[model samples]
Target chain A: GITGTWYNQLGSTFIVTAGADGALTGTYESNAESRYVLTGRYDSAPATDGSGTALGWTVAWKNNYRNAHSATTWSGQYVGGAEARINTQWLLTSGTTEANAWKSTLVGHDTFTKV
Target chain B: GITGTWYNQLGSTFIVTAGADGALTGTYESAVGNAESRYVLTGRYDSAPATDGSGTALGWTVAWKNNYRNAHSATTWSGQYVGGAEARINTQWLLTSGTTEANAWKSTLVGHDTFTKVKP
Candidate 1:
């Protein structure tokens, strides 16, 4: 149920695949056109009736040229069934040096809909 | 100020440096005795001060083994800074990872801790 392509408010796209054991792996392409790998886990296996589930994921920008030193994690719940949507809270952090580190920390929320 | 070395209930150590503009940078070393590597943290301090001149809201994030190709985890903390004779930070944290099972307890652990500034 949580396996598919979803787009956030900013038009960023995330294509995720849910494992039988609740492991989540995906690729996220931000609105900025940067692509990165993501890994996380869901609270439970997909329900037989297709229902909402809680999940969380992180995108590490280790090798990306644009956000090479930053990482972002999103924690949210996915509402499955007729009107599918994912509601999430996110924190993005950047800067490897003390001078710029915390200044670049950002907090925000996003709602994602099936694409 | 939220700058200094701090110790949590579990004896984990965090050394932080606060910027004039409310930015926070730090290093976190968990109590795990396997000699695990220290993690880097990035966070913000609210510009608005509390009654005692402490920031009301503080938050931070740390990605464990972020540079590795293998499985890793990321943790985030949302906290409040309290000031007094013995100032402390009360926080709630969430840790997310891929190596957990649906039936496993604490797969996505949520916990709280109060950290006190370590005195020299």
Candidate 2:
């Protein structure tokens, strides 16, 4: 019972979703600046009474359990991956140490509303 | 001259191409499993039709400026991204080190072929 199309753009890349009436009542996909992957419905927060309509999302950019980092790192507001969002903790991957991992917590919750 | 057809798929992903009899020519693009992009042409031994119409692909998984590694890394067997082609150095920027930036280079030279390095 979902409808319409949703899409976002970055530089020149973009991520969009389209559905009508009951075409795709439940479907989800995640994409970043340089990566794209599929996700399950249960992952996103309840949208339409757990029906999969809301745009709720979680973050998973720095949780890589392995905490793979190096002296070489990007210093700035530090923008993680786009499109895909995570909560609790992001997925973990072996860090640069090859044996260690770390979790990055959300600095704060930034909410946006109609002006 | 060099001209003909080529394409093969190991699994779901396959690299294929087709050409005409000289007068036949058009744009060129790269196609991998889930990656695709445009590549500029370069000089080489002799490609008959040039632009890798013959296949001089090389390995890009190894060779890096900084051999950096750490606790948060992949056994690093360190594979890298595929496609987008590279040279001499095939442009390395991948691995569990989170050093991924180039997004292409790894696994063995087996999977990827058709990359070349040439200077102006």
Candidate 3:
């Protein structure tokens, strides 16, 4: 059911397509800075009666020309059925090769609404 | 230097020890189910300061056992230091458990909390 364009609180946009198998593929436009490919999975398709759905996805910056090597994963749920809104938490891990990767790991939250 | 006991707004407690290699080992006692069982905690800590001066970032996961659902659930926390006169850890968490895809919505939860050190 999450097969549409969604916008997050941070001004990021997600154009997502959900497959029958719950596989999600999309393009994420982050803060209008850059667009990147994203992939993730959903627990299950939403019920016809408008039920909550669980899903998560990841965006990696491997190809960014900025050389900012990082990956951000979002875990969230869409609630209110027809009024579906995504309430998710994210972790952006940067400097993976650093001796202390955790030092560069940033955590945040964002809510997404269908556009 | 997150080597102390911390408590979250939810009344849960975390006892953590950080190693030189950034490996973190800790105990997480949840406030749910009125249970005294302590969940196993594993995570990492970064000594490097965050670029924004918020402090350093740390992440950890806790596996729940003997919970009300009897179904296995795991919670992960992503946090950053909020340095000031009173040190704090601003965190966001995601809890997930195995469940039918149709009912997956029922098995996931997201929340945030500010943790304060209660013991050194």
Q: Number of clashing pairs, model 2?
A: 30
Query: Model 2: what is its DockQ?
Result: 0.02
lDDT of 1 by residue, A1-115 (tens): 6899999777789999977744567788864447766666565433333334656666655332443444566765676666688766676544333243346456677889986
**How many angstroms is residue A14 displaced in model 2 relative to the true structure, after the best TM-score fit?**
6.2
Q: Local error of candidate 2 at A52, Å?
A: 9.0
What's the C-alpha lDDT at position A60 in model 1? 50
Stretches of candidate 1 off by over 4 Å are: A1-115, B33-35, B50-55, B66-71, B99-107
By summed lDDT, which 10 consecutive residues of candidate 3 chain B come out lowest? B63-72
Give me the TM-scores of chain B across the candidates: 0.79, 0.22, 0.83
Q: In terms of TM-score, how similar is model 3 to the real structure?
A: 0.51
DockQ values per model: 0.06, 0.02, 0.06
List, residue by residue over A12-101, the lDDT tens digit for candidate 3.
888988777445677888643587666655544344444446566665553333334445667666665565687776787553323453
Give the candidates in order of lDDT, highest first. 3, 1, 2
Give the interface RMSD of each candidate. Answer: 10.5, 18.0, 8.1
Clashing residue pairs found in predicted model 1:
none
lDDT per model, in order? 0.62, 0.19, 0.63
lDDT tens string, model 3, B1-120?
588889987788989897774556768887775356675565555544436444565666654543332324445666565556787876667776544447764766777767898642
